[PDB]
Amino acid sequence: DPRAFLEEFLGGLLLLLDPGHRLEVRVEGETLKAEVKGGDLGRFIGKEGRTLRAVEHLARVVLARRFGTGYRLVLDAAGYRSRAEARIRRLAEEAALTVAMTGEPLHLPPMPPGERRIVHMLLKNHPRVTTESQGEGEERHVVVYPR
Amino acid sequence: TPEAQGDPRAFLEEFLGGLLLLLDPGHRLEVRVEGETLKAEVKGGDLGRFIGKEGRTLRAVEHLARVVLARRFGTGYRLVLDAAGYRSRAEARIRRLAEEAALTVAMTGEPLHLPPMPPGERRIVHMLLKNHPRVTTESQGEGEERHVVVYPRREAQG
RNA sequence: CCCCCCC
Ligand SMILES: Nc1ccn([C@@H]2O[C@H](COP(=O)(O)O)[C@@H](O)[C@H]2O)c(=O)n1
């Protein structure tokens, strides 16, 4: 059972991270969702979500190694994903502002595909700007182009 | 914080051992104590697959092991994780950028800004270009955008 | 325009 496996695995790490952490794992469409509550959560998240991503990444890998490909897993704490999407929706809305004036394209910072997706999605059918990614790997980033 | 040898060694052995079992049963683990720091190497199994895309996996294991060591003992013991000469090949890539910067800067007489870099990586740049007869180094900026600038020992007149 | 490779 993928849920029970994640519970034992993520429960193992959570104990070493903070005894106040508690875990809920649920499926929501195609996506396995792991929510952490309790204790100093910012310490769990870490600077720029660095700790939460390391857990999420490793959780994904041990999940793939036992059950195979096709799973989507997202790990979250105290609505940190929302805030990160909102901040991403901002700055992108800011990009369409700058590119609107200056007819010169604008290069956004590198982002993983899930975050580039959000940029593409917000600026969908924007009257002034389009989006298209560039570069490869950790280099890859969205470019805001003018019409 | 407690002595590196003893519990911190055994703690990391058991923690990484459990993680490596799920990643690949072929993995074995050597954990070395260097003074009051810890060093850990993963051997066996598919090491390419352990490292993962652009090293994301080895790095997430390193980061997380550091964090849980700090939670357990109060320090990360400057833990450094390696596999299949990963750390060495990345030390070389950083050295390459600094080399190409040295050449360009000594020619143009203009400073060049290297890509932003963690302090660990910034040290490698500084050390490689110490006592370099044509260029020098000095960092600039704050936070994630702190990066080494390579300066010509003798500036362009202009 | 997921993300881990079984890339
Ligand atoms: N000339 C230099 C400059 C920095 N360093 C090292 O590089 C690290 C990064 O410092 P910067 O902020 O100067 O890049 C320092 O913490 C120090 O260990 C060095 O070893 N020699």
Crossing angle, helix A50-67 and helix B7-23, to 10 degrees? 50
Which CATH architecture group holds B88-152?
Answer: 2-Layer Sandwich (3.30)
A129-134 β-sheet, strand order: A106-110, A141-146, A129-134
Distance, CA of A69 to C1' of C3, in Å:
9
Of the candidates A26, A136, A13, which has an alpha carbon nearest to the alpha carbon of residue A72? Answer: A26
Task: Give, in degrees to the nearest 5, the angle at Cα B50 between B49 and B53.
Answer: 65
From CA A1, how far away is CA A143, in angstroms rounded?
41
From CA A128, how far away is CA B93, in angstroms rounded?
40
User: Any bridge partners for residue A76, and if so which?
Assistant: A35
Q: How many CB atoms lie within 10 A of CB B124?
A: 19
Q: Residue A33, class by beta-carbon neighbours within 10 Å (0-12 exposed, 13-18 middle, 19+ buried)?
A: middle
Read off the amino acid at residue A11: G
> Would you state the structure tokens that stand for residue A118, as one six-digit string?
């959000």
State the fold for domain A83-146: Ribosomal Protein S8; Chain: A, domain 1 (3.30.1370)
Which residue has the least CA–C1' distance to nucleotide C1? A117
> Would you state the structure tokens that stand for residue B13, as one six-digit string?
């052995």
From CA B144, how far away is CA B16, in angstroms rounded?
28
A133 touches strand C (CB under 7 A): yes
Read off the amino acid at residue A47: K
From CA A70, how far away is CA A133, in angstroms rounded?
24
> The tokens 């500084």 sit on which residue?
B126
Contact A33, A79 (CB under 8 A): no
Phi, psi of A49 (to 5 degrees): 65, 25
Resolution of the structure in the document, Å: 2.7
Nucleic strand C contact set for A 9-48 (CB, < 7 Å): none
Contact B32, B43 (CB under 8 A): no
> Which residues touch A129 (CB under 8 Å, ≥6 apart)?
A95, A96, A99, A100, A123, A144, A145, A146, A147
A50 touches strand C (CB under 7 A): no
Return the residue whose CA atom lies nearest to atom 8 of ligand 1. B123
**Binding-site residues of A for CMP:** 116, 133, 140
From CA B27, how far away is CA A73, in angstroms rounded?
25
Across chain B, the runs of DSSP E, i.e. the strands, are: 28-34, 37-43, 80-82, 112-113, 135-140, 147-152
Cα-based torsion angle of the residue sequence A146, A125, A76, B66 in order, rounded to the nearest 10 degrees = -20
Helix intervals (H) in chain A: 2-17, 41-45, 50-67, 80-101, 113-122
Contact B95, B128 (CB under 8 A): yes
Of the candidates B116, B157, B108, which has an alpha carbon nearest to the alpha carbon of residue B135? Answer: B108
> Which residues touch A91 (CB under 8 Å, ≥6 apart)?
A108
Q: How many CB atoms lie within 10 A of CB B128?
A: 16
Convert A93-105 to b/e letters by CB count within 10 Å (16 or more is b). eebbeebeeeeeb
Which residue has the least CA–C1' distance to nucleotide C7? B53
Contact A47, A53 (CB under 8 A): no
Contact B148, B138 (CB under 8 A): yes
| B19 touching A (Cβ < 8 Å) | yes
Instruction: Count the residues in chain B.
Output: 158
> Which residues touch B103 (CB under 8 Å, ≥6 apart)?
none
Delimit the domains of chain A by residue range.
2-78, 83-146
Which CATH architecture group holds A2-78?
Answer: 2-Layer Sandwich (3.30)
Nucleic strand C contact set for A 60-119 (CB, < 7 Å): 60-61, 64-65, 68-69, 72, 112-117
From CA B137, how far away is CA B149, in angstroms rounded?
6
Of the candidates B124, B78, B74, B83, which has an alpha carbon nearest to the alpha carbon of residue B101? Answer: B124
Distances (CA, A) of B67 to A7, A16, A67, A133, B146: 20, 9, 27, 34, 23
> Which residues touch A28 (CB under 8 Å, ≥6 apart)?
none
Q: The domain B7-84: what is its CATH number? A: 3.30.300.20
From CA A60, how far away is CA B141, in angstroms rounded?
35
Distance, CA of B132 to C1' of C1, in Å:
46
